[PDB]
Amino acid sequence: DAYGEFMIQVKLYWTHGYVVFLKHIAHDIYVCGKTINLLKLCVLMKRSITAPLAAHISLVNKAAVDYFFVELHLEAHYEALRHFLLMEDGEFAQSLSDLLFEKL
Amino acid sequence: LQPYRQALLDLEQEFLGDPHLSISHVNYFLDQFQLLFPSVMVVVEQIKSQKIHGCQILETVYKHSCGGLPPVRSALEKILAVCHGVMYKQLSAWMLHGLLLDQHEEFFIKSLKQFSLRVEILPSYIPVRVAEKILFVGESVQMF
């Protein structure tokens, strides 16, 4: 539904935008869809319609976070950039700066 | 108002069977509406004229259902039950979640302020004590 009646529409990678009925789960689906479209390249109120829906949002987000760590080792890339870019490790900073500053 | 319409239908059936019925005959059949119709007229007239807002409509009809004429009393009491239906429907919301349904018209309830009790508008057949209990339930269910 990109016809103009639906509130959501169709690197940075997604130009999907979003900008009375319960918007409390509507706006959540908009971000929960960006997550799934990224993983492909990797009283009156709703109380029986929101029930098979909010049960799916949390499962989607937590499994998507889980995939990064336990398959692609994203937690190791941080403690990898920390060794060089923060100059944590010895035998690298004492060898880079000592050679570079002799020139200037 | 349904038996008045039904009575006029039956009147036409008898007119078809024989139309020589006198006018006083029709008066004789319809004497039981003859007392009921002038009485309720002042209740509905006061509702229009005074531009009543909020819960006071319930009190206005409840006061005239204290009379000693059974047709008038039963007839107004049924309307008050119909109007109880809407109040119970909003009460199903505010005690259970805190959400309102009726806007701009009072239903004698608005945790703390922006959910407080509006004490003054409250109907006359309802004590203040039970309003305190309702207020507790709504504030607490909103809290957790």
Side-chain angles (χ1 to χ4, degrees), chain B residues 38-39 48 59 63 65-66 70 79 90 95 97 118-119:
Chain B
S39 40
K48 322 165 199 201
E59 305 181 35
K63 288 314 168 187
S65 52
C66 316
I79 301 176
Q90 293 102 34
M95 296 205 306
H97 311 264
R118 46 160 95 108
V119 308

Side-chain angles (χ1 to χ4, degrees), chain B residues 14-72:
Chain B
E14 302 210 51
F15 291 163
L16 298 153
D18 173 48
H20 306 340
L21 317 184
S22 279
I23 301 171
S24 197
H25 195 204
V26 192
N27 202 282
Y28 172 67
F29 292 121
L30 280 290
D31 282 325
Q32 66 157 279
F33 308 93
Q34 185 55 240
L35 88 165
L36 171 81
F37 275 18
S39 40
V40 303
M41 186 62 195
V42 298
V43 177
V44 57
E45 184 70 61
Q46 286 164 60
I47 293 162
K48 322 165 199 201
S49 58
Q50 306 176 358
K51 299 299 179 296
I52 300 178
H53 184 66
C55 318
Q56 307 281 162
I57 299 170
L58 314 156
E59 305 181 35
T60 309
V61 67
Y62 177 75
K63 288 314 168 187
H64 288 68
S65 52
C66 316
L69 291 160
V72 183

Side-chain angles (χ1 to χ4, degrees), chain B residues 105-121:
Chain B
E105 199 87 41
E106 293 174 290
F107 52 111
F108 63 88
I109 188 63
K110 291 177 185 176
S111 326
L112 74 174
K113 182 65 183 191
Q114 307 309 127
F115 305 84
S116 310
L117 191 66
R118 46 160 95 108
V119 308
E120 68 273 16
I121 197 71

Side-chain angles (χ1 to χ4, degrees), chain A residues 2 12 43 47 64 72-73 90 97 101:
Chain A
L12 58 91
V43 75
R47 288 167 293 157
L72 307 163
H73 285 309
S97 319
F101 293 147

Side-chain angles (χ1 to χ4, degrees), chain B residues 4-16 29:
Chain B
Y4 188 82
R5 315 163 183 186
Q6 185 55 50
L8 260 56
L9 298 176
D10 188 29
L11 284 177
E12 184 47 61
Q13 177 57 44
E14 302 210 51
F15 291 163
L16 298 153
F29 292 121

Side-chain angles (χ1 to χ4, degrees), chain A residues 43-45 47, chain B residues 89 93 99 101:
Chain A
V43 75
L44 272 301
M45 49 195 306
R47 288 167 293 157
Chain B
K89 190 70 167 60
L99 295 168
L101 306 176

